[PDB]
Amino acid sequence: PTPVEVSQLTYNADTIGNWVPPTELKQTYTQDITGLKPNSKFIIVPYMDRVSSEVLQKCTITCNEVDAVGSISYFDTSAIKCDGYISFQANSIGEATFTLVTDYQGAVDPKPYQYRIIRAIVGNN
Amino acid sequence: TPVEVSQLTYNADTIGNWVPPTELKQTYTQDITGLKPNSKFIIVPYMDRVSSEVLQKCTITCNEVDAVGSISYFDTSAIKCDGYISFQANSIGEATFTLVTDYQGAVDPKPYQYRIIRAIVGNN
């Protein structure tokens, strides 16, 4: 494995996905993001391309991986929030686990909240 | 002393506000300043902002040679906080962005908001 030289640093920011929506109005649950390069270091940020529910769908996310730092916030009604970030390292099999805490006023058919994963392509990252 | 590859971290704490429009349809530019000269960055949108409920659309590109991508904001019903731009800062630590806005109302608009991410590795 030949490391990418520092002078050749670039960011890959095209890995996007969906957070699994809640089945209850108040829920705490986990989701495993899979298929990441094992042991690579990432920043995950929220983004939004999503019709507002207009029923106050609040979601907060943290990461369960060792040494992960930060928190992500979504809110879709009036005071829109698409905020925060988590720095984390994928585990030895290319997975990271997150904890979702949701508090939705209505949850008939919730549209997923959306994330983007950012990876510096440098060294063996 | 350069940062060796095994000590890669990210700094994602530089945030800022995009200059807001004064006409309903407007094109303008903004110089972002105070970046490490010649370092490579990624800029992403974020939102922590009360919606205008009057269809404030903003589209952003970067004028820097080497820049790639585009950012979109929209605050009413079909919400957009989307896209990204990868770019290098210039020799004096700056980058120029072009904003194209299409706002159904523009009475004292609240800025759209951004986050700059830097990989801390090598001399970046």
Residue numbers in the entry:
A (entry chain B): 2 to 126
B (entry chain A): 3 to 126
Provide the publication's sentences verbatim.
A major factor that limits the expansion of shrimp cultures is, however, infectious diseases from viruses, such as P. vannamei nodavirus (PvNV) and M. rosenbergii nodavirus (MrNV), which have inflicted heavy economic losses. The Nodaviridae genome comprises two single-stranded positive-sense RNA that encode the capsid protein for viral capsid assembly, the RNA polymerase for RNA replication, and the B2 protein for host RNA interference suppressor. While the shell domains (S-domains) of PvNV and MrNV contain conserved sequences of 62% identity, the protrusion domains (P-domains) and N-arms show low sequence identities of only 17% and 43%, respectively. In this work, we have determined the cryo-EM structures of T = 3 and T = 1 PvNV-LPs at atomic resolution, the crystal structures of the P-domains of PvNV and MrNV (PvNVPd and MrNVPd), and the crystal structure of the S-domain of PvNV (ΔN-ARM-PvNVSd) in the T = 1 subviral particle (SVP).
As for the MrNvPd, three crystal forms (P3221, C2221, and P4332) were determined. The overall conformations and dimer interfaces in three crystal structures of MrNVPd are similar with a RMSD < 0.3 Å. The MrNVPd has a structural fold consisting of eight long stretches of antiparallel β-strands similar to the PvNVPd, but shares a low sequence homology with PvNVPd. In addition, the MrNVPd dimer is stabilized with hydrogen bonds between Leu255 and Tyr257 of the β1 strand and Lys287 and Ile289 of the β3 strand. Second, two MrNVPd dimers (C2221) in an asymmetric unit form an X-shaped model with the antiparallel β-strand interaction through an extensive network of hydrogen bonds between residues from two β-strands β2 (Gln273–Asp278) and two turns β1/β2 (Val266–Pro267). The two dimers in the X-shaped model are orientated with a tilt angle of 130° and with separation of ~63 Å between the two linker terminals. Notably, the sequence of the interaction region (Gln273–Asp278) of MrNVPd is distinct from that of PvNVPd, and two types (P21 and P212121) of PVNVPd structures do not exhibit the X-shaped conformation. It appears that the X-shaped dimeric MrNVPd organization reveals no homology compared with intermolecular P-domain conformations of other viral capsids. Although the X-shaped model is observed only in the MrNVPd structure, we speculate that this organization might both exist also on the T = 3 MrNV and PvNV virions under various environment even high salt or low pH.
